[PDB]
Design a protein around this ligand. Sequence first.
Ligand SMILES: CCCCCCCCCCCCCCCCCC(=O)O[C@@H](COC(=O)CCCCCCC)COP(=O)(O)OCCN
Ligand SMILES: CCCCCCCCCCCCCCCCCC(=O)O[C@@H](COC(=O)CCCCCCC)COP(=O)(O)OCCN
Ligand SMILES: CC(C)CCC[C@@H](C)[C@H]1CC[C@H]2[C@@H]3CC=C4C[C@@H](OC(=O)CCC(=O)O)CC[C@]4(C)[C@H]3CC[C@]12C
Ligand SMILES: CC(C)CCC[C@@H](C)[C@H]1CC[C@H]2[C@@H]3CC=C4C[C@@H](OC(=O)CCC(=O)O)CC[C@]4(C)[C@H]3CC[C@]12C
Ligand SMILES: CC(C)CCC[C@@H](C)[C@H]1CC[C@H]2[C@@H]3CC=C4C[C@@H](OC(=O)CCC(=O)O)CC[C@]4(C)[C@H]3CC[C@]12C
Ligand SMILES: CCCCCCCCCC(=O)O[C@@H](C)COP(=O)(O)OCC[N+](C)(C)C
Ligand SMILES: N#Cc1ccc(O[C@@H]2c3ccccc3C[C@H]2N2CCC[C@@H](N)C2)cc1
Lengths: 290, 99
Amino acid sequence: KIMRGPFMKFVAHAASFTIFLGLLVMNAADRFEGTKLLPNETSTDNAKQLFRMKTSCFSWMEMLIISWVIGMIWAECKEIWTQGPKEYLFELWNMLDFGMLAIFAASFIARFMAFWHASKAQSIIDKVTLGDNVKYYNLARIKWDPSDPQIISEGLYAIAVVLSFSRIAYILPANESFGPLQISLGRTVKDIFKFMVIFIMVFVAFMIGMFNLYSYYIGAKQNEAFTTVEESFKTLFWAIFGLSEVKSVVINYNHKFIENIGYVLYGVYNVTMVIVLLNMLIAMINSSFQ
Amino acid sequence: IFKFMVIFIMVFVAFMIGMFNLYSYYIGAKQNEAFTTVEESFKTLFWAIFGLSEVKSVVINYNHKFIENIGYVLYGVYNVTMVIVLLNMLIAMINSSFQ
Ligand SMILES: CCCCCCCCCCCCCCCCCC(=O)O[C@@H](COC(=O)CCCCCCC)COP(=O)(O)OCCN
Ligand SMILES: CCCCCCCCCCCCCCCCCC(=O)O[C@@H](COC(=O)CCCCCCC)COP(=O)(O)OCCN
Ligand SMILES: CC(C)CCC[C@@H](C)[C@H]1CC[C@H]2[C@@H]3CC=C4C[C@@H](OC(=O)CCC(=O)O)CC[C@]4(C)[C@H]3CC[C@]12C
Ligand SMILES: CC(C)CCC[C@@H](C)[C@H]1CC[C@H]2[C@@H]3CC=C4C[C@@H](OC(=O)CCC(=O)O)CC[C@]4(C)[C@H]3CC[C@]12C
Ligand SMILES: CC(C)CCC[C@@H](C)[C@H]1CC[C@H]2[C@@H]3CC=C4C[C@@H](OC(=O)CCC(=O)O)CC[C@]4(C)[C@H]3CC[C@]12C
Ligand SMILES: CCCCCCCCCC(=O)O[C@@H](C)COP(=O)(O)OCC[N+](C)(C)C
Ligand SMILES: N#Cc1ccc(O[C@@H]2c3ccccc3C[C@H]2N2CCC[C@@H](N)C2)cc1
């Protein structure tokens, strides 16, 4: 009768999230100071099994995480067929919570199919050379394919681990000192979503304009900026935080016309972004005394 | 600012564990020694508040560009989130001085 009260129910639901975060921390606890399994090395630990056997096998802590995610998917489907699939998408945090579970499910599916391929190939080979169906396995991380499911799972698990820390927003407005901070932090994301439109207009403008300038100098440039659309995207994205050098507008030829055009366009980009961010800061300072 | 450091260390611990889990298996096959130990992933995200952490700390030497693009996206989202949190702190402290 105590555990059916609302406050003990809240305490139990917060404790079962503290446990999940503790599992996510202590899962990678053998590698806190170095993994001791090099990307070029090979460790079998049984002298009769493949290397790709003791990499995709599930531990005793990677099954509890699967049980938590299965219960967390079931507790979301029960919310879907009780509030209705139209009033459930009305809050965007439900979509932010559904994407995390979808990414966790995709990660565990990819790891399971990697383990399934490893077991299907290890059933054949139950020292010497191996045939061309087991030869891809028992190989270190340097020789894997770029689309191996073992590196799809390890890539999606990181996004899932980052996104699962955002469920503190469900237990944080019950407090008298971090509730108003969450309210005042949420009201300043809706104030920058309207300035990101002009931000991406100026961004797309200078991205296409400098890609059109430095496209023909792909091998004759000081580095690899402004030559591909993704390179021109990241060179202008990391210049907001000052992490893009001025050596990214220099070419190796004697065409100083194009280099001076690039210098002028990069300077105008930096000045324009400073003006836009200062206008955003002043507008958000002004829309808090209202 | 003692009350905003709590949300600051929530976002910090989130991205620290999330990027340590990504770049853990590439300890010798990476451009530098970031995001491989917990102290390296801690200091790479601490010194990125002051802009003293380069973008070459998310680059691996292999042809696994999936994991490298995940690291690029996570580092960019970390920088944008910290800019939002610090700007919200500055605006809140400007507002709680005319009261
Ligand atoms: C939302 C409002 C946006 C307003 C944007 C205005 C901000 C203007 C920023 C100026 C950017 C300068 C960048 C400096 C880097 C290097 C410049 C450089 O190499 O100089 C050019 C200078 O060329 C120009 O004509 C600069 C004109 C810039 C006008 C920009 C106005 C939008 C080369 O000419 P020179 O080498 O002096 O000539 C040979 C003499 N020995
Ligand atoms: C508190 C609020 C926080 C809001 C956070 C939102 C801020 C979003 C920042 C964007 C970060 C981008 C970093 C840029 C660095 C390099 C990006 C890169 O390498 O591109 C990825 C782009 O991949 C994506 O899908 C980007 C999606 C990012 C969405 C983030 C939303 C949270 C690779 O794909 P690709 O090379 O275009 O594909 C091959 C085509 N030739
Ligand atoms: C393992 C590492 C990654 C750290 C894991 C994080 C947790 C240990 C922390 C972070 C957020 C904390 C919570 C933030 C807010 C609250 C509300 C608080 O309740 C009240 O303020 C009064 C209740 C009322 O009167 O309504 C009880 C503690 C609790 C759940 C905290 C419990 C401990 C939490 C889960
Ligand atoms: C918004 C409206 C008013 C139009 C924009 C103003 C233009 C009339 C200005 C702004 C940028 C200027 C350009 C910036 C840089 C260059 C490179 C410069 O080339 C060299 O420095 C020669 C190098 C060498 O061979 O030694 C010649 C002038 C030029 C084209 C400038 C020409 C005049 C421009 C187009
Ligand atoms: C908050 C909720 C709404 C969920 C978050 C949104 C996701 C649906 C987005 C955000 C980050 C995106 C990822 C960022 C980077 C990558 C790497 C990219 O891989 C490559 O570029 C291939 C490289 C090569 O081999 O050439 C594939 C897409 C992917 C996984 C993206 C998949 C879709 C993601 C997970
Ligand atoms: C990806 C980064 C991970 C970092 C984790 C930090 C968690 C802090 C959450 C937080 O401050 O929420 C802000 C966005 C306000 O949300 P809202 O717009 O008030 O919406 C709250 C609605 N509710 C149903 C969740 C209560
Ligand atoms: N009786 C009761 C009860 C239990 C839980 C509850 O909120 C859940 C919760 C509690 C602590 C920490 C994180 C989360 C996530 C919240 N979850 C609920 C369903 C939809 C899903 N998108 C989000 C509300 C009411």
